[PDB]
Symmetry: D2
């Protein structure tokens, strides 16, 4: 279960580089130079790294400082063969964004958020990123009067529409992926789930340029089934990136390493990504716990990739098992895939076997055999 | 705070008629004749009643029994002046639907679900209903292998598309409202939130025929902000019906009377419905607690309407208060409503006040004044 | 991973016998004769069965009917070698208990609840049960004025004290195990967690006669860590019974088969029970999903036992691995087990290495190595 | 609804002094001198202030710096008439406590935690505090192998026992109040609820010296009913302090001003505190949202006190209303307060009206009238 860059595992700079500051605690680790993280991740068998503008270039940097930071980073990428598939903007840390970036009540802040983002899209393209993530983590409210959500959605559409116009105007080959989260750090966040984000995207001027970036833990913070949400995204053709991590239920955003948290959901996720042939990178957005030193940091990142690979093997063995293929037919998963009424409406209305002569009790007496199927899945996961 | 039929308050038959059976308990009340509920609700000042096919006509009824049940019901409606604005199908109670109706793995069940629904659409139109609700409460799974969600969404689209073709083919003036719920009775339910349902609707062959029917408690069972979700539905133009009730947090679906549960969220909901000029009926989907006798049943229903009316008065007084109007400007709610960049992209890119000369620290130092605003809202709610 | 009666696996009659009625659905299975469940469970390798009074003897039964039901049941137990380690009373199903049994506001109901329970304690002793469970599932409220919780706790203490006096007065060798649940079917249930129940027990007249019966799913419905709660119960010496099942997070009580739900928590539970040498039976309180026929019922029950046995093997291999024993020392689990100050208070106050000369920064720089340890645990669970 | 120091409202220094740093954000406010907070709070009508050692004296301070900080603080208290009823130790912020204070796996850290606490108990007594709070916010784990909870509870008992021995040995008049929290910042925290903390306390060498300090939001983060928990604490005689704030459901710890969050639960809490005659201070542990400037900070604190006072008036009017007193009798709240069997066990066993002649159906048919009662409570809360 050794990763190679062929597995397309990617990590944010802000993941392994998290210093360990939390709402109740100071940093437990020193800051990492992005150069050293590139090198360390490459040695573990990662394929690439991603970044927020402010992870790579300190906020307030001069043109000349900005150029140096990027130069050094590009040299580490060239020294290792690491790629940058994705970038994103920090619209959440600085106090100016305390009420939002794109949906800040202050219009001047909204304009500044757009300009900060556009500056970073140019950088992303320069580094070869083809996906640009937006996580509106400050877009929302703690109280009901502070934000009119209809006006905010108008502002959010206008921002995303302006970005689309920009990338179109530059001829850039980049698409956007909107990252939903239900809460934290705001009391409630706008576009709280994959579904709200998919629906929002269908109202944009150029919907083909935008997809979702679902994160395991964010959906699980609302008690939702992350595999189900990913399936809806895939069904829609809008899964443009994915963030992998662990989460133990409905609480603060834990960002555990992928595989920790809800292990069976992590199995069904890998099963789905692999069976759908998802072609994007397997991106980890996690935090090594503040209890850890740097050795524990690199062990944590390695564990993300290892767990993916074990689950990939177990899911592949599950689908390939003749006994599972038989159970899947016993549970009528093959019938779920057939059209309900390819014969058409009128034929359905004229079919007495669909109503007048349908034996509801015999249909009702047929067991689904789902427990046998699920026990086979558990035996495969556990290698029993 | 006395309701009149002008207030357009409606109730499901299955609400006041709930006998009190729960997963751990037998019925505590006898069955109500829909005639008696019509009369009792009219006396309390309700405007109308709604129904599942099986609330009005016992499952398995002959043509002649079906005709009698409907006759008697129509006579109560004519005796009282009560309307039927909405109907829906029961695709959840009978054992045949144990794995779904429209997304049952068994294709024969899917065809029967469609036919049962189409039969009830004809009845609804006959009674004057202009909205038809669909709550796929059995559509989902307890385990990951039992349902391929992409195949299920294909089946769900095909069902809703067939229904749309039917109503179009009959020239009926009725629209559909899809009711999301995240779980219960399935482990996870397909289209779990307002957002997932809005996004689904945009993939149907005739999206204009379908909206959402959000229910207070269903969104709150995922820890989501129900006013925020309603605002997104309104923004989309897809709020085709609403279900009002109470819920105390993330647990089983309580169906408390509207006003119980999350009282401040109920205030911000009424504020939003009234300020948006929502024109649909104020429909209550609640259960009088099994502790209650019939006197408590009618008190519970009366309390739904009373609480709405009190909250309507308090929200209206909040928005009309000059001191609140001033606080709203202090918090820049007027600025949230202005376009971010009506000047256009190029002008935003050339505006140095948006970036090079933007004073981020002075912007950041400006307080939002949201606590003053929220305390005014609390003072109004409480009449302090 | 084949169970034998030596493994001491037990099942409630109401588990495999659940007909599949839920709040939104009719029964999907016919009723099982307790005789047939005894036989079927014995064939699967169970050790015993447990019961509510009303699972074994229909409510309202004559003396002569009651005698026949018990006779037949005793014959199945004698035919199979199955034991009855535990019984309990149904104080929740019948409408009379709609506001409680022991804490019903109506005093006459409280007296009847006591008498119904005492009648069943005599039966339990007759069948050889040494543990008597009490689950006050109706003890609680949907609204704040309906129950004064201090008066209710007085009533609950008086009931448990009366029961203690009874068993003492009869010389019976039986102890009680109070089963906490945070909600469902009441809005909030009294003694909602293991902790509330442990604390309550310390106020009873004879605390040695009472322990807790924690259930996996009940603690998880409050988002609590079930292994942690069990460790507190063990630390207190009050783990008198345990109920094993699965639950996917904070939602209605799912009662999935043990092993489904939170798989890693199920691993750490088995690890703890086995390492503490818990000597009680491994009791399953689960419901085969209503999707299943009887073949699926027996597969579900078999899966409970199989999953326990797989997890027992994986936890045993984890603790026995020299590399895990080394990681446990690297993480200072051996130091957690040593007394903080066996030297005494005065020596701690006079120890400059504890304060004036304590190097806080060198202590703070030491990593805990918890991610390495946890990845070893994950590798063992998965057999990687 | 103007507070006076007679109302005994208290605030932590760390409340109004919170700079606004969160897991995703930098500080939005400058640091407050504790002198200025004392003055500002006194002007708003607060009675007192509380503190962590590190809120008043910067970590690492010399003896001479420590003396100056305390001097200045004492001068503000003398200038205003503000009291210090309570203090507590910071065992969570500094990196040295990343795995705990009293239950850190490293024994040297455990000894340092004790000494840091003992130093602050001496200060507290010097300032006149009679309650000392302990919030073990780092005591817990993100993973199952990192903490053996039985060993940790042994360490926690030993620490609390040592503290008890210290205060006894000094003749100090101070008691301890243990503050439960279910999670955050640890994945799961030891003693997660009021119940776990009450039960723990009964195992200490001198249980009379320890009580609980329940916080509204902490219980609500587990979805528990905070009034119910407070009633159990009162019933036990262990409510030694209380922390008041707001929380909207199961999510990260919001620390909203008291009255925001779950408004009806805040009503039933005040009802209970006032009706039980709780004599401790009404302590607010909240954070003014980071959106606010200092004007919003003082408005937020004022709003805590105002909301308490409004709710106190509404609860008092509810209990004093003859129509509510009648409803309370209709719902048999008077009967809940009577002993179930003051006649004794033998008389209960010989009473045929408790079993053989008990009419279960007539008992079952009696409605509880709880909805009428609850609507009266809602009308009072809203002043309708
Ligand atoms: Mg992310
Ligand atoms: Mg509904
Ligand atoms: Mg149980
Ligand atoms: Mg606190």
């Amino acid at each position: 279960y050794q990763p190679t860059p062929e597995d397309r595992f990617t990590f944010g700079l802000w993941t392994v580089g998290w210093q360990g500051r939390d709402p109740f605690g100071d940093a437990t680790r020193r800051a990492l130079d992005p150069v050293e993280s590139v090198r360390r991740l490459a040695e573990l068998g990662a394929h690439g790294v991603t970044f927020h503008d402010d992870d790579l270039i300190p906020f307030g940097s001069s043109d000349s400082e900005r150029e140096e930071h990027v130069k050094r980073f590009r040299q580490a990428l060239d020294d290792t063969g690491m790629k940058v598939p994705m970038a994103t903007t920090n619209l959440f840390t600085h106090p100016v964004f305390k009420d939002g970036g794109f949906t800040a009540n202050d219009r001047d802040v909204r304009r500044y958020a757009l300009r900060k983002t556009i500056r970073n899209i140019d950088l992303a393209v320069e580094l070869g990123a083809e996906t640009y993530v937006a996580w509106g983590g400050r877009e929302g409210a703690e109280s009901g009067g502070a934000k009119d959500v209809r006006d905010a959605l108008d502002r959010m559409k206008e921002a995303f529409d302006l970005l689309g116009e920009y990338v179109t105007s530059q001829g850039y080959d980049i698409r956007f992926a909107i990252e939903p989260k239900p809460n934290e750090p705001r009391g409630d966040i706008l576009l709280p789930t994959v579904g709200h984000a998919l629906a929002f995207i269908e109202r944009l001027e150029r919907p083909e340029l935008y997809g979702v970036n679902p994160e395991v833990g964010h959906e699980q913070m609302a008690g939702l089934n992350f595999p189900h949400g990913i399936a809806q995204a895939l069904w829609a053709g809008k899964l443009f990136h994915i963030d992998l991590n662990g989460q133990n239920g409905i609480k603060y955003d834990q960002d555990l390493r992928f595989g920790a948290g809800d292990l069976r959901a992590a199995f069904w996720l890998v099963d789905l990504l692999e069976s759908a042939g998802y072609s994007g990178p397997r991106h980890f957005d996690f935090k090594p716990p503040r209890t850890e030193d740097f050795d524990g940091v690199w062990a944590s990142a390695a564990g993300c990739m290892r767990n993916y690979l074990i689950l990939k093997e177990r899911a592949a063995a599950f689908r390939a098992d003749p006994e599972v293929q038989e159970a899947l037919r016993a549970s009528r998963l093959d019938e779920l895939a057939r059209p309900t009424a390819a014969d058409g409406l009128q034929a359905l209305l004229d079919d007495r076997s669909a109503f007048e002569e349908f034996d509801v009790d015999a249909a009702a007496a047929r067991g689904m055999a789902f427990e046998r199927l699920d026990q086979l899945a558990m035996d495969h996961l556990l290698g029993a």
